[PDB]
């Protein structure tokens, strides 16, 4: 489980390094939308929720917004693209603290390919 690392300014902006053999722990609180933003030029193919009805998915290019629309919304999201496949573990938080407003990925595989 990748648990994303918060920024130094605000704890609502979190950073995680993409690893193809690991999943990302997303803590979604009630009534906020989480901005998940993919790599530049990455073409989204398909996704799949554990519950299509627990979470709301909106995408515009490489910008993905999710939002819990039901109680006890514990599922997983697997959004697959041309380059890689992202696996998230959406676990709803019960006290509406410690939200995540934006998740941003650091890809070391593309940096290694550049190296």
């Amino acid at each position: 489980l990748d648990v994303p690392s918060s920024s130094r300014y605000d704890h609502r902006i979190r950073y995680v390094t993409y690893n193809p053999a690991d999943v990302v722990q997303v803590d979604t609180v009630l009534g906020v939308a989480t901005h998940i933003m993919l790599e530049e030029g990455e073409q989204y193919l398909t996704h799949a929720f554990g519950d299509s009805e627990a979470y709301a998915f909106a995408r515009k290019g490489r910008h993905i917004f999710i939002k819990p629309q039901a109680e006890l919304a514990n599922t997983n999201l697997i959004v697959v693209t041309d380059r890689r496949s992202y696996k998230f573990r959406l676990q709803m938080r019960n006290d509406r603290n410690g939200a995540m407003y934006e998740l941003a990925f650091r890809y070391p595989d593309t940096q290694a390919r550049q190296t």
Binding site: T46, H47, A48, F49, G50, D51, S52, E53, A54, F57, A70, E71, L72, T75
Partner: peptide
């Protein structure tokens, strides 16, 4: 119909992708 039971039924009913 406890909330856990309602969640379980919702998990059963829902499809993979909505719409």
């Amino acid at each position: 119909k406890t909330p856990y039971e309602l969640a379980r039924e919702r998990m059963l009913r829902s499809g993979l992708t909505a719409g």
